[PDB]
Each structure stands twice: as C-alpha cells, then as structure tokens.
C-alpha cells in the first residue's frame, strides 16, 4: 500500500517533471510586503496576490548573481522539481515566472516561522516533540527518494511550521533528480555527510545522515558537530565521534548511532530494508506513520497568528527595492525556467 501510494505519486510526478509549468503569473499581480528571509541570489518576500487576496512567499533570484555563483543548473533543478512534487510536508509552488532581471517562485506562505527560530529560543525540544518532526522528515524523504530526488539541505532553517504545527520543507536549491551517484560539494557544514566532505561520489544516504544531525540538534539544542570554522566542523564529522547529552534516551542514542554512521554499508536508510529500518526502530515505536501523513496527530506546538499577513514569527531583514532592467539578462541560461 505504501508501494501503491508511491507508484501513483511517481506517475503524478513524472507528468509534471517531463512537462513543467512555466510563466504562470507576472510580477505586477503581487503586492510586495516584507522580507521573510534572505540568500545569495535575492530574498523570500511576503506578497499579496491581488486577484485572490491570498498571501504568498515569493522567492526572488537575480539571474546575474545565479550565473556568477555557478548555480544555473541547481536553480533549474529547484523550479523543475518544486513544480512537480506533491506531499503534505513540501511547500507548494503556486506560480513561477521570470523578467529581464530575475527569477520568481511564488510559494504557499507558512506563517508559523522557521523551526530554527523556535528551537534556538526554547533551547531544545523534548523527545516526543523531536519525534513528531522527525517522523514528517522520514516520510518526506521516503517520498523524495522514491522519485529519485536527493534533497541535500536538511536543517531547521529550511523547515517551516504551519498553522497546524506541521512541517513545510522549503528551499530546493540543492535538490537533484539522480538515479546514480553525484559529486557536487553542497549543503550546510554541520549537516554534511563524511562522503561529501571527502569528495567521494555520494547518493541519497546523505539525507539520512542529515536526518541524524537534525534529530540530534532538535533533542540536544545544539548540533553533534560544531566549531567556529567549517574546517574544524569537517574534522569532527569525518572522525564521526559522537557524544550524546546524558538526558538522551538509550533508544534515541541507538537510532542516532545508526543514522550518524560513517560506514554506508551500516547506515540506516541505506540498507536492504531501506526506510523500514528507521520506521521500525524502537525510538519510533509510538509513532503512527499513517496518522502523521494524514495530519491527525496533535502538534506539540501551535504558533501564534495575529491574522493573515502577520510576519512576527520571522526576523526583520533590510529591504532592497526590486529593479527590473530594460535589457534581458541571461536569456539562454534560463530559457526553460
């Protein structure tokens, strides 16, 4: 039945993957409100769709900055994948378009803010609170990996909390459809699997290692490998010596030792039983997988919302005005967008 759900999900994905939606809106249909978060190529802004009165989160990418940073293929991967996927824990892409200067991805607005903000403020999540979030990541990865997709950017910063206290995965800038091994050095220092640091060819198992880092960070309040400089973080990861807080349950530690396994022949998610080694682990015994997918499990935390268009669950960012050049930039590089 999971097999049946997945096969049908694949048929749906493939049709959109092979025939992508393109130029489904225009910049002047949206009222720009405030910056929700930033990046190397632009920003993610709270916008209002005038025709419907709906609020959205619009990702703006400067084509020239994308080209300079050699992120062309990664950008085309992000939009092509996002428009083709459909899962309760994946942010919906409502519209995409481009102009002379920029690329635009209009997504569902997630008002609850980043998991990152709530985790840093509160300090750490209890094991049932962490388990609730981890279960949603486990299902999301089971879905993505079945479609030959590697996510490659798991971290609390990319996990948004909706009105129901459920996760919405955002930022697909490193997502890639790959049947075999891949080599691009990308991700976040704290979340990188040793295979990535060691310039080896790697596969989906890097997402399962990143899941180990996420579960550890949510339950400890800090990641398993941290230092002031990324080179020092990399030395810690490749040794893979993990120390656990005294408050971590024996089951939590056992799950984490299997997830933060430097040996790929031993890493959970990577074995012959695949995701089932994770889903059947003792730490997940109380998890009802179907109820998680159906959103019927009550969330341990429901964010505050002072109506539609409120941004208080997000930090404030310096505003930069959108300038659209008279001349088309990087036309050929982004023709398929």
């Amino acid at each position: 039945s999971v097999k049946e759900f997945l096969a049908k999900a694949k048929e749906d994905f493939l049709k959109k993957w092979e025939n992508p939606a393109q130029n489904t809106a225009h910049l002047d249909q949206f009222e720009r409100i405030k910056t929700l978060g930033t990046g190397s190529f632009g920003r993610v802004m709270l916008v209002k769709h005038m025709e419907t009165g709906n609020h959205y989160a619009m990702k703006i990418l400067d084509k020239q900055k994308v080209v300079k940073l050699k992120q062309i293929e990664h950008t085309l991967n992000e939009k092509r994948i996002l428009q083709a996927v459909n899962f309760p824990f994946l942010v919906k892409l409502e519209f995409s378009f481009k102009d002379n200067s920029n690329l635009y991805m209009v997504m569902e607005y997630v008002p609850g803010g980043e998991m990152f903000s709530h985790l840093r403020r509160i300090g750490r999540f209890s094991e049932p609170h962490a388990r609730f979030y981890a279960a949603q990541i486990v299902l999301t990865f089971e879905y993505l990996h079945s479609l030959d997709l590697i996510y490659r950017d798991l971290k609390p910063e990319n996990l948004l909390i909706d009105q129901q206290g459920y996760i919405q995965v955002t930022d697909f800038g490193f997502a890639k459809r790959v049947k075999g091994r891949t080599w691009t050095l990308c991700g976040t220092p704290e979340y990188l699997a040793p295979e990535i640091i060691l310039s080896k060819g790697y596969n989906k198992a890097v997402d399962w290692w990143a899941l180990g880092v996420l579960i550890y960070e949510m339950a400890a309040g800090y990641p398993p490998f941290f230092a002031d400089q990324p080179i020092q973080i990399y030395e810690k990861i490749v040794s893979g010596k993990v120390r656990f807080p005294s408050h971590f349950s024996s089951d939590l530690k056992d799950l984490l030792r299997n997830l933060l396994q430097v040996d790929l022949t031993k890493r959970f998610g990577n074995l012959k039983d695949g995701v089932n080694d994770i889903k059947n682990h003792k730490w997940f015994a109380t998890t009802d997988w179907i109820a998680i997918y159906q959103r019927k499990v009550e969330a341990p935390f429901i964010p505050k919302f002072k109506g539609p268009g409120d941004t208080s669950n997000f930090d404030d960012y310096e505003e930069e005005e959108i300038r659209v050049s008279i001349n088309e930039k990087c036309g050929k590089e982004f023709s398929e967008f």
Partner: peptide, 20 residues
C-alpha cells in the same frame, strides 16, 4: 558545558549553505 560552548560559538545564527 556543551550548551555554554555552543552558545558562546559564532555558529548559533542561521547557517549559510556552502557550494562548489
């Protein structure tokens, strides 16, 4: 404590992605 070492580190804010 590990918490005090983390809190005093320069890596408690939003972490940037790395590439190429």
């Amino acid at each position: 404590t590990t918490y005090a070492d983390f809190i005093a580190s320069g890596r408690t804010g939003r972490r940037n992605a790395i590439h190429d």
